[PDB]
């Protein structure tokens, strides 16, 4: 049970930089250590207010960088609970477009006028109809 | 002179010296060498040990001490001359024992010196005798201890074949010389090492 | 020091890059000269041992000395090599296969060792080098690399996988320290 | 955040809001990094006017093609040459595949052109990490905007030097972009350096940042341009302040190629 000397030196100032409840800017290294040290610096506030507990979201340019965020954060948590975990009893998830995650829905309705939003609407409609009385055929 | 230096000289007593025909001369030469060594620096010290056939013995333990050293050596060797282990009655010598004694002394001197600064020491063997298989474990034990200690073991083989000593120098990073012309003993001691 | 017996195959880079003046007179001259100093110091520290000498030059491997226990052949071979110099590019796979062939023969309690002095960036050999590295580790042939100003990944993995000795040399003083490190025996 | 951002101003400029500021990591000495510039050495080295760098054949042939070949052949390490466009890249390296018979580099490098393929990209990075000068991130050409900017997350310090053959610069299309340039003239007046130059230099800094990765690694990064001093002001590149105690990140020298080889000996020694 510990965290870096760097995190200890710059925690109070970072909690203060966070207090303003709207915005802030942070200087960090060229990449190695930056994202993991953020997770270490948000460990200080993982339950700042018990009556509402705020959440973290991260924005990312491409899919291979997302696995770098997940693999580091998976090492830091080690598990969702004290049963195997020791910094954060957190739950974390990757996501990206329906256009990336799902190949078969792009393939089957092949038409020019077939927006990625529309395909979720179409799949939802087949599921409601199929569940009703079309499961055998739609 | 800043560094204290202890040079231990192990003299192989073996009756091989008979083949030499002289021990008295060898002592005289060794004495001259010691006096020079002590004279070179204040901080130089010397210890002399005899590796005899039966056992190893301490001949002596500073340059001011030299007069004392000379007497102690002459007397000690004469006692050694005894008939037992005569001629090649016993080909080998107890070098392992001598080296053990030398390392003990070096260690003790070092501890005292530890109170102060570092000490540098090296061991010189004047070897007349031959090595034997039985000797291998004991000798190597002492040799390896010296190497770890980083104490060089130099050897001057007047005669005979002590392979272990040759190995001891390579190992220890010391110097080994098989002397052609044993009467040149003084030159080798001064020059060789 | 006595306790066991060593077999070591000294491998030298005789590529065109070894001609360069960066390390005294030129790298070839400074490396062979210090390597002669190492042979006599290793054989003095290791009286019961063997060495064999190989070079890589002009996209091939050549045997400068056969595997033997007399130091004199190896210093005489390092003297004879300097005149014929270096040109072209390595052949490391063929040099590890001839070295393997000699080293595989050796008995149970003796070391298996390859020492490489490396001033290149790759090697000309077509054969799959990873199969040969796997085979070195099974055979217990340990390979060490002393590189000149160079960390190119296949060589570094090859020395780590075979036992853990990829070293960089930036001066004639540093190269004598590295060879003198290799003079040191293994545990028995 | 963006790794570096010490000159601070551009983000509050873009926001029209004033965030709380904070620097929240302990940095390492300047000496593990080296950030060169190249332009010529003697007074006869006049071919780099860059009044029309996209058309100046003599300038492409002279230190733009020739300095790259001198630096790459002398400094034999895995080095990626970043270019401002494909067309420059194609003209500078004759390669196996030449745009003309008249082009001025002859040396084994690898390409990174359009229709990059995710599987094909890896083949080139496998080659650069394994051995030899050439590969992706190795002695290879790529446009700085392109995919090579994602990099690879290898432990091995696969990269050594990057030589930006031209400073990464951008344009402003005579449509919505031109309308934006006018608006920011009206508001800032000092619009050109903020709207285009600084924004292109960060494009540079991402590629060099991806090469050197962070505090636990070492590297260098060179820029090839006539106008390069302008780039050095306002701390628009990584060279700028992080801790006063660091003893500066200076790059002036009478010879770049020698200074980087001396710097690599220094790094092997460390």
Swiss-Prot record, chain B:
Name the chain's protein. General transcription factor IIH subunit 3
Q: Which UniProt keywords apply?
A: DNA damage, DNA repair, Metal-binding, Nucleus, Transcription, Transcription regulation, Zinc, Zinc-finger
According to its UniProt record, where is this protein located? Nucleus
In the record, the note on similarity to other proteins reads: Belongs to the TFB4 family.
Function of the protein: Component of the general transcription and DNA repair factor IIH (TFIIH) core complex, which is involved in general and transcription-coupled nucleotide excision repair (NER) of damaged DNA and, when complexed to CAK, in RNA transcription by RNA polymerase II. In NER, TFIIH acts by opening DNA around the lesion to allow the excision of the damaged oligonucleotide and its replacement by a new DNA fragment. In transcription, TFIIH has an essential role in transcription initiation.
Q: Which organism is it from?
A: Homo sapiens (Human)
Would you say which domain of life the source belongs to?
Eukaryota
Q: How does it assemble?
A: Part of a TFIID-containing RNA polymerase II pre-initiation complex that is composed of TBP and at least GTF2A1, GTF2A2, GTF2E1, GTF2E2, GTF2F1, GTF2H2, GTF2H3, GTF2H4, GTF2H5, GTF2B, TCEA1, ERCC2, ERCC3, TAF1, TAF2, TAF3, TAF4, TAF5, TAF6, TAF7, TAF8, TAF9, TAF10, TAF11, TAF12 and TAF13. Component of the 7-subunit TFIIH core complex composed of XPB/ERCC3, XPD/ERCC2, GTF2H1, GTF2H2, GTF2H3, GTF2H4 and GTF2H5, which is active in NER.
Task: Write the gene name.
Answer: GTF2H3
- Show the coiled coil region(s): none
Any one Gene Ontology MF annotation carried by this entry is: RNA polymerase II general transcription initiation factor activity
> What GO terms in the biological process aspect are recorded for it?
DNA repair; nucleotide-excision repair; regulation of DNA-templated transcription; transcription by RNA polymerase II
GO terms for CC? core TFIIH complex portion of holo TFIIH complex; nucleoplasm; nucleus; transcription factor TFIID complex; transcription factor TFIIH core complex; transcription factor TFIIH holo complex; transcription preinitiation complex
UniProtKB/Swiss-Prot annotation, chain C:
Q: From the Swiss-Prot or TrEMBL record, state where the protein is found.
A: Nucleus
Which tissues is it found in, per the record?
A: Widely expressed, with higher expression in skeletal muscle.
Name by which UniProt lists this protein: General transcription factor IIH subunit 2
Q: Which residues form the VWFA domain?
A: 7-183
Question: What task does this protein carry out?
Answer: Component of the general transcription and DNA repair factor IIH (TFIIH) core complex, which is involved in general and transcription-coupled nucleotide excision repair (NER) of damaged DNA and, when complexed to CAK, in RNA transcription by RNA polymerase II. In NER, TFIIH acts by opening DNA around the lesion to allow the excision of the damaged oligonucleotide and its replacement by a new DNA fragment. In transcription, TFIIH has an essential role in transcription initiation.
Full-length numbering of the shown residues: 54 to 241 of 395
Phosphotyrosine occurs at 42
Q: How the protein assembles, per its UniProt entry?
A: Component of the TFIID-containing RNA polymerase II pre-initiation complex that is composed of TBP and at least GTF2A1, GTF2A2, GTF2E1, GTF2E2, GTF2F1, GTF2H2, GTF2H3, GTF2H4, GTF2H5, GTF2B, TCEA1, ERCC2 and ERCC3. Component of the 7-subunit TFIIH core complex composed of XPB/ERCC3, XPD/ERCC2, GTF2H1, GTF2H2, GTF2H3, GTF2H4 and GTF2H5, which is active in NER. The core complex associates with the 3-subunit CDK-activating kinase (CAK) module composed of CCNH/cyclin H, CDK7 and MNAT1 to form the 10-subunit holoenzyme (holo-TFIIH) active in transcription.
Please report which protein family the annotation says this sequence is part of: Belongs to the GTF2H2 family.
Query: What is the native source organism of this protein?
Result: Homo sapiens
Curated annotation (Swiss-Prot), chain D:
Outcome of altering residue 227 to W?
A: In XP-D; vitamin D-mediated activation of CYP24A1 is impaired in patient fibroblasts due to altered TFIIH-dependent phosphorylation of ETS1, subsequent impaired cooperation of ETS1 with VDR and altered VDR recruitment to CYP24A1 promoter; damaged DNA opening by TFIIH is impeded
> What does the entry report about post-translational modification of this chain?
ISGylated.
Mutagenesis or variant effect for residue 5 to V: In XP-D and TTD1
Task: Look up the record and name the associated disease.
Answer: Xeroderma pigmentosum complementation group D: An autosomal recessive pigmentary skin disorder characterized by solar hypersensitivity of the skin, high predisposition for developing cancers on areas exposed to sunlight and, in some cases, neurological abnormalities. The skin develops marked freckling and other pigmentation abnormalities. Some XP-D patients present features of Cockayne syndrome, including cachectic dwarfism, pigmentary retinopathy, ataxia, decreased nerve conduction velocities.
What does the record's free text say on domains?
Interacts with GTF2H2/p44 via the C-terminus of this protein; mutations in the C-terminal region of XPD do not alter its helicase activity, but prevent its interaction with and helicase stimulation by GTF2H2/p44.
What is this protein's function per UniProt? Answer: ATP-dependent 5'-3' DNA helicase. Component of the general transcription and DNA repair factor IIH (TFIIH) core complex, not absolutely essential for minimal transcription in vitro. Required for transcription-coupled nucleotide excision repair (NER) of damaged DNA; recognizes damaged bases. Sequestered in chromatin on UV-damaged DNA. When complexed to CDK-activating kinase (CAK), involved in transcription by RNA polymerase II. In NER, TFIIH acts by opening DNA around the lesion to allow the excision of the damaged oligonucleotide and its replacement by a new DNA fragment.
Descriptive protein name: General transcription and DNA repair factor IIH helicase subunit XPD
């Amino acid at each position: 049970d510990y965290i870096y000397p760097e995190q200890f030196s710059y925690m109070r100032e970072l909690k203060r930089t966070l207090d303003a409840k709207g915005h802030g800017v942070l200087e960090m290294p060229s990449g190695t250590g930056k994202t993991v040290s953020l997770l270490a610096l948000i460990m200080a506030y993982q339950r700042a207010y018990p009556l509402e507990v705020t959440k973290l979201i991260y924005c990312s340019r491409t899919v291979p960088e997302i696995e770098k965020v997940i693999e580091e954060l998976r090492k830091l948590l080690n598990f969702y609970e004290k049963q195997e975990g020791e910094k954060l009893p957190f739950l974390g998830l990757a996501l990206s477009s329906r256009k990336n995650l799902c190949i078969h829905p792009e393939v089957t309705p092949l038409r020019f006028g077939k927006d990625v939003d529309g395909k979720c609407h179409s799949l939802t409609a087949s599921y409601v109809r199929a569940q009703y009385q079309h499961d055998t055929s739609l | 002179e800043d560094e204290l230096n202890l040079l231990v000289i192990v003299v192989d007593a073996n009756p091989i010296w008979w083949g030499k025909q002289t021990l008295s001369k060898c002592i005289d030469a060794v004495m001259v060498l010691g006096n020079s060594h002590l004279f070179m620096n204040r901080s130089n010290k010397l210890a002399v040990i005899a590796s005899h056939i039966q056992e190893s013995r301490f001949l002596y333990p500073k340059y001011e001490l030299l007069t004392s050293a000379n007497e102690v050596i002459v007397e000690e060797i004469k006692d050694l001359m005894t008939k037992s282990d005569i001629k090649g009655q016993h080909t080998e010598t107890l070098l392992a024992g001598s080296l053990a004694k030398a390392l003990c002394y070096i260690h003790r001197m070092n501890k005292e010196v530890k109170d102060n600064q570092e000490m540098k020491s090296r061991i010189l063997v004047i070897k007349a005798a031959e090595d034997s298989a039985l000797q291998y474990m004991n000798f190597m034990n002492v040799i390896f201890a010296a190497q770890k200690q980083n104490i060089l073991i130099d050897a001057c083989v007047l005669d005979s074949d002590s392979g272990l000593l040759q190995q001891a120098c390579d190992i220890t990073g010391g110097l080994y010389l098989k002397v052609p012309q044993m009467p040149s003993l003084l030159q080798y001691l001064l020059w060789v090492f | 020091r006595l306790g066991m017996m060593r077999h070591l195959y000294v491998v030298v880079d005789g590529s065109r890059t070894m001609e360069d003046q960066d390390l005294k007179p030129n790298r070839l001259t400074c490396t062979l000269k210090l390597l002669e100093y190492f042979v006599e110091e290793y054989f003095d520290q290791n009286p019961i041992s063997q060495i064999g000498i190989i070079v890589t030059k002009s996209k091939r491997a050549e045997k400068l000395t056969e595997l033997s226990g007399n130091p004199r052949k190896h210093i005489t071979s390092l003297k004879k090599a300097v005149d014929m110099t270096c040109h072209g590019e390595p052949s490391l796979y063929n040099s590890l296969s001839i070295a393997m062939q000699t080293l595989k023969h050796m008995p149970g309690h003796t070391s298996r060792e390859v020492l490489i002095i490396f001033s290149s960036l790759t090697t000309c050999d077509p054969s799959n080098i990873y199969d040969l590295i796997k085979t070195l580790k099974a055979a217990k042939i340990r390979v060490s690399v002393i590189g000149l100003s160079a960390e190119v990944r296949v060589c570094t993995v090859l020395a780590r996988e075979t036992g853990g000795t990829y070293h960089v040399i930036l001066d004639e003083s540093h190269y004598k320290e590295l060879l003198t490190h290799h003079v040191s025996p293994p545990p028995a | 955040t963006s790794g570096t951002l010490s000159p601070l101003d551009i983000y509050p400029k873009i926001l029209d809001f004033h965030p709380v500021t904070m620097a929240t990591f302990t940095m390492t000495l300047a000496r593990v990094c080296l950030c060169p510039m190249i332009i010529g050495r003697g007074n006869d080295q006049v071919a780099i006017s860059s009044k029309f760098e996209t058309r100046e054949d003599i300038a492409v042939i002279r230190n733009y093609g020739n300095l790259l070949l001198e630096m790459s052949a002398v400094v034999p390490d895995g080095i990626v040459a970043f270019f401002t466009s494909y067309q420059y890249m194609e003209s500078t390296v004759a390669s196996w595949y030449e745009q003309g018979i008249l082009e001025n580099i002859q040396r084994n490098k690898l390409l990174f052109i359009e229709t990059q393929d995710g599987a094909e990209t890896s083949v080139a990075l496998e080659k650069y990490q394994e051995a030899c000068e050439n590969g992706r991130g190795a002695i290879l050409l790529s446009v700085a905007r392109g995919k090579v900017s994602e990099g690879i997350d290898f432990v091995h310090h696969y990269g050594r030097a990057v030589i930006m053959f031209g400073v990464p610069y951008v344009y402003t299309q005579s449509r919505i972009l031109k309308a934006r340039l006018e608006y920011l003239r009206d508001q800032f007046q000092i619009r050109e350096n903020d709207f285009l130059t600084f924004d292109a230099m960060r494009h540079a800094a991402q590629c060099v940042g991806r090469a050197i990765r962070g505090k636990t690694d070492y590297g260098l990064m060179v820029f090839a341009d006539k106008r390069f001093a302008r780039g050095d002001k306002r701390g628009k590149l990584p060279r700028w302040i992080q801790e006063h105690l660091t003893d500066a990140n200076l790059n002036l020298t009478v010879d770049e190629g020698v200074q980087v080889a001396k710097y690599f000996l220094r790094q092997m020694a460390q």
